[PDB]
Design a protein around this nucleic acid. Structure first.
Ligand code: MG
Ligand code: MG
Ligand code: MG
Ligand code: MG
Ligand code: MG
Ligand code: MG
Ligand code: MG
Ligand code: MG
Ligand code: MG
Ligand code: MG
Ligand code: MG
Ligand code: MG
Ligand code: MG
Ligand code: MG
Ligand code: MG
Ligand code: MG
Ligand code: MG
Ligand code: MG
Ligand code: MG
Ligand code: MG
Ligand code: MG
Ligand code: MG
Ligand code: MG
Ligand code: MG
Ligand code: MG
Ligand code: MG
Ligand code: MG
Ligand code: MG
Ligand code: MG
Ligand code: MG
Ligand code: MG
Ligand code: MG
Ligand code: MG
Ligand code: MG
Ligand code: MG
Ligand code: MG
Ligand code: MG
Ligand code: MG
Ligand code: MG
Ligand code: MG
Ligand code: MG
Ligand code: MG
Ligand code: MG
Ligand code: MG
Ligand code: MG
Ligand code: MG
Ligand code: MG
Ligand code: MG
Ligand code: MG
Ligand code: MG
Ligand code: MG
Ligand code: MG
Ligand code: MG
Ligand code: MG
Ligand code: MG
Ligand code: MG
Ligand code: MG
Ligand code: MG
Ligand code: MG
Ligand code: MG
Ligand code: MG
Ligand code: MG
Ligand code: MG
Ligand code: MG
Ligand code: MG
Ligand code: MG
Lengths: 77, 46, 94, 62, 103
RNA sequence: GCAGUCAGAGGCGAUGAAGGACGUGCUAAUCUGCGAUAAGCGUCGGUAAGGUGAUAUGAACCGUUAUAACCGGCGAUUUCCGAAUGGGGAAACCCAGUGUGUUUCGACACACUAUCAUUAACUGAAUCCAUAGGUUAAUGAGGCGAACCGGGGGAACUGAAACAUCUAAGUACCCCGAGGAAAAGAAAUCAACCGAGAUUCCCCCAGUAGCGGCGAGCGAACGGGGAGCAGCCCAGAGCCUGAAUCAGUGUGUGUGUUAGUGGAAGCGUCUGGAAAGGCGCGCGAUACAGGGUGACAGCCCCGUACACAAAAAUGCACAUGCUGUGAGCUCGAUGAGUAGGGCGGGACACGUGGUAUCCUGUCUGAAUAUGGGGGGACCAUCCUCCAAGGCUAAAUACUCCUGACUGACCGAUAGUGAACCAGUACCGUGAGGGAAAGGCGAAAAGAACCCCGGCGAGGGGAGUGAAAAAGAACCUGAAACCGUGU
RNA sequence: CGAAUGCUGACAUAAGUAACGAUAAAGCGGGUGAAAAGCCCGCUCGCCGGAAGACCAAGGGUUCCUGUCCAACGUUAAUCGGGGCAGGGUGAGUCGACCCCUAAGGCGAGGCCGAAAGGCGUAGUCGAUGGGAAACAGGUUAAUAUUCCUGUACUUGGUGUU
RNA sequence: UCUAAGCAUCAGGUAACAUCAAAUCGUACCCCAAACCGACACAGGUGGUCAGGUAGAGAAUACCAAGGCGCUUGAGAGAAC
């Protein structure tokens, strides 16, 4: 699915309100990409399907801190 | 004149039988309906 | 060797009929009433022990039950299995 | 007779289980023809197979 | 649990045969005793080829309610009732009149 | 059948379920029961003179002072299909592999072998170390079921006397996950210069303040009265060392539950087919709740008020040994891609309005106790509070099922669709739809025997019964409708 | 309750009227029987004969064969019947299925994809309507036969030898 | 039919002979029809196989063989239509 793998973002649903306030159902998709991350301790690359908000988290916390959260979550990479 | 019911036991069983009514999520709810209603004959299958 | 407890369940009754009587006095054939899951190697192995008489060959058939009516109500008789055991020469049976 | 068959062994209740089934075979053939006018004897042997089969499982690890 | 038993002598309380003493012959599971001699009815019995009955109009015994009799007391000559006490660690029965044990 | 009240129980399943198929009798069928030990086997208790389930007789037997039968506790056995799990499949079938014991060498019996998840050991590529992967092990999951509960998605008819904002309505329906309840929950909450002190639920406030093509409609809070009550832990170092609490295992010990035990007291006459009725004279009641008995019974029977009971298994409670978890003091820390912001939507009674607050798809982004949030645009002062980590009982919601009791609820075209072998017969390829059908009599005493007739159907006598125009096409027996006689 | 082309059951009317389902067609003698245009036997006559004969598959599911019965069923009567009731009847190494192999197509360990449910698909695993061993003639039952019996064969596997 | 890992003095191969085995299921009856699909004992529908005589080009057609049938209301009369 369109699920970010660090944050856990996901498609959410809303409306397309027009100028006459007609409401039709749409979705809001998350800004997902796939990206190789160099992990210095293991000395390899890791591909993750991560949002642009989630690439900014690995900039803040570190890739070793992030991947520890996904093991304790029970999620595989 | 040819009428709409032209019987065939193999096609009787592949399309409406017990193992067909177990191979999908919706076909299993057909059997759960007919058990709570109380059907003696639960499928087409002899 | 089939176990002695299985050989005591294979045979059920003798079949009585005009055709069953005719083969006994012509073809040296006894016509038995056997179990439904019995097999030709057990029908041969239970006549050769419990009757003490040698068998040539076994011919089996399954008989299908009849649909009857108990007044207004429908019901059906059970299917059973029927063996034509061929005895050997000089072999008479109690 | 499960009070009485309890004073026996696994060696005997295999011999004892084997003589009721010889007896059961000669009752079923006798009731196939019109030669058994005592049909309370089919039920007695079949109920006594069960007492011996019960004592075989009480002995074998129960 | 039961009061009237197989070979008691009863006395009938209601019916066409009120008042006649007699021995019970059996008790059925429907709450009905068949008492010897009392409730005699006539059945037009149909003959059959087998089973060796000549067949006629037989007079025989019919089932009466257990509630419609009572254990006759031989000493008093009346209908009396039945109680349950324990003697010798065994259940017994006695008469509600004069409190003497049925034996 | 229907609607409730009071109290249980709130699940079942790889130790193979729900639902089935096939078998199973002295048995031809169907129903209930059971599973190749097949209307049943053992044991431990209860109880007993009568029994061997139903239509439903018969035959063959068992039992009477205690292993006949029945009732309850704990066991035994429990075919095949079904999550079905060794592979496959047109459910109830088809074909094995491996290992272990016997084999009169023809062959039999027993056990194991799905998948996923986590964990562990043995191994193990490109490629050196590695790693992906590979192979065995142990432990867990899976399926079904009434509503209630929480979350992921989410209509239209309709109303507006048309209709598009709005309504219907976060309703119907689909999906995921629980539990006996769930969820919520210990203030970055309100108040208003006085103060209250988590959550849930009931009554007021109140059709109020407001929202609204300011239309149709939608609709609070503040504060008050009640139900119920409860507060703690971690972002962590010394001193104390098993002291506070919770579960688990055990054991004593109550109290229920699952079979049971005794239980009062009435007769004569009249009518009648039959007395319980009428009329006389009596007795019981801590019991005149109820039911049956040949018409209407406190006293004939079953019970009822009351008084006793458990070898065994088990629920909620107490007490006691128990593994693990740690009280208390002492100083110290104080939840960052977070709060706020721009954009697009959703939630708030509040439709973007002058709109505070909450959630976030997208783009950004602090201060950190001297600091920060809220007080309905916004600012100063004052007040109150400490977000970005968790846990928590009661009051609240519901009924597939169990037991007892009730009704100005129904009485067979009603009440369940079904009082009756009904989700059956029957109709449809299927999903699915879906009936009609209750009453002899007190008891079969259910009509021996003779007669006409085809060894018929049907009728006439006889007999049974209070009644036979109560004769099985059976209580009563209306109307339409059709006849014979005057 | 009198009406809603109301709902269910009963019962009228037309009316003892239309009709009795291919215009291939019947006649008589005898038998059975309570009863014979229709059943059985006999003799004649007519119709089909690339079918209206014989053998199967699919579908059905005992309709098969014999004895008994004529209420209902059969567009009439019925002694007859595919009707009621009871009994009997289906015999395989070689026929068919199973089994071996695959087609279209189906499912699908992991995998990739998707709010959930789910979608597609690799290895594999199913799926005939196609490929893969072998038996003939005569005789026999009321009802089965390449299966039973008589004669004469053939095929594939396990075992033991040399 | 060919070999590779393997196995090498064992397997296994293949020629003769002897021997045992070939299980389980279906098998009746109808099948252009009164038994299947059409509410019906319904002038309808329904795949394959076998293919005698005389005439004939013929599996058309007429008459026949083997074989099977006269189609489950009949009797009269001899108007209109
Ligand atoms: Mg809309
Ligand atoms: Mg043979
Ligand atoms: Mg066979
Ligand atoms: Mg009985
Ligand atoms: Mg499977
Ligand atoms: Mg399996
Ligand atoms: Mg398979
Ligand atoms: Mg609308
Ligand atoms: Mg509209
Ligand atoms: Mg409108
Ligand atoms: Mg909770
Ligand atoms: Mg204050
Ligand atoms: Mg008692
Ligand atoms: Mg009493
Ligand atoms: Mg009485
Ligand atoms: Mg009366
Ligand atoms: Mg944090
Ligand atoms: Mg924000
Ligand atoms: Mg703002
Ligand atoms: Mg916004
Ligand atoms: Mg932000
Ligand atoms: Mg804030
Ligand atoms: Mg203000
Ligand atoms: Mg904080
Ligand atoms: Mg907190
Ligand atoms: Mg009704
Ligand atoms: Mg009535
Ligand atoms: Mg109804
Ligand atoms: Mg049907
Ligand atoms: Mg008569
Ligand atoms: Mg009456
Ligand atoms: Mg009447
Ligand atoms: Mg009338
Ligand atoms: Mg009326
Ligand atoms: Mg009116
Ligand atoms: Mg009317
Ligand atoms: Mg008329
Ligand atoms: Mg006429
Ligand atoms: Mg007319
Ligand atoms: Mg006319
Ligand atoms: Mg006419
Ligand atoms: Mg005609
Ligand atoms: Mg005709
Ligand atoms: Mg004639
Ligand atoms: Mg004729
Ligand atoms: Mg003739
Ligand atoms: Mg022609
Ligand atoms: Mg039949
Ligand atoms: Mg016939
Ligand atoms: Mg017949
Ligand atoms: Mg007649
Ligand atoms: Mg007729
Ligand atoms: Mg017939
Ligand atoms: Mg073959
Ligand atoms: Mg697929
Ligand atoms: Mg998968
Ligand atoms: Mg494939
Ligand atoms: Mg295959
Ligand atoms: Mg084929
Ligand atoms: Mg083939
Ligand atoms: Mg034939
Ligand atoms: Mg045939
Ligand atoms: Mg034909
Ligand atoms: Mg016809
Ligand atoms: Mg036709
Ligand atoms: Mg003319």
């Amino acid at each position: 699915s369109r699920v970010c793998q660090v944050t856990g973002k996901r498609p959410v649903t809303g409306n397309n309100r027009s100028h006459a306030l007609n409401a039709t159902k749409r979705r809001f998709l998350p800004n997902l990409h796939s990206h190789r991350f160099w992990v210095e301790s293991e000395k390899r690359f890791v591909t993750l399907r991560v949002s642009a908000k989630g690439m900014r988290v690995i900039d803040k916390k570190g890739i070793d801190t992030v991947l520890a959260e996904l093991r304790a979550r029970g999620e595989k990479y | 004149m040819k009428r709409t019911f032209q019987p065939s036991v193999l096609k009787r069983n592949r399309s409406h039988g017990f193992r067909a009514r177990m191979a999908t999520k919706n076909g299993r709810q057909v059997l759960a309906r007919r058990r709570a209603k109380g059907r003696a004959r639960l499928t087409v299958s002899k | 060797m089939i176990r002695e407890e299985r050989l005591l369940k294979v045979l059920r009754a003798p079949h009585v009929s005009e055709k069953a009587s005719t083969a006994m006095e012509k073809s040296n054939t006894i016509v038995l009433k056997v179990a439904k899951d019995a097999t030709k190697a057990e029908i041969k192995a239970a006549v050769q022990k419990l009757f003490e008489v040698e068998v040539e060959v076994v011919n089996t058939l399954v008989v299908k039950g009849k649909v009857k009516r108990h007044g207004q109500r429908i019901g059906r008789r059970s299917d059973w299995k029927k063996a034509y055991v061929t005895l050997k020469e000089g072999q008479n049976l109690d | 007779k499960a009070k009485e068959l309890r004073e026996k062994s696994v060696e005997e209740l295999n011999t004892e289980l084997l003589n009721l089934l010889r007896e059961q075979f000669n009752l079923r053939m006798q009731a196939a023809s019109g030669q058994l006018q005592q049909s309370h004897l089919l039920k007695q042997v079949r109920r006594d197979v069960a007492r011996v089969k019960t004592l075989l499982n009480e002995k074998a690890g129960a | 649990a039961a009061k009237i038993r197989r070979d008691d002598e009863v006395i009938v309380l209601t019916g066409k045969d009120k008042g006649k003493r007699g021995k019970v012959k059996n008790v059925l599971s429907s709450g009905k005793v068949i008492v010897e001699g009392i409730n005699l009815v006539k059945k037009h019995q149909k003959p059959v080829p087998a089973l060796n009955q000549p067949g006629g109009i037989v007079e025989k015994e019919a089932a009466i309610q257990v509630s419609n009799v009572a254990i006759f007391n031989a000493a008093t000559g009346k209908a009396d009732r039945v109680g349950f006490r324990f003697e010798d660690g065994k259940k017994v029965r006695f008469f509600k009149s004069n409190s003497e044990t049925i034996k």
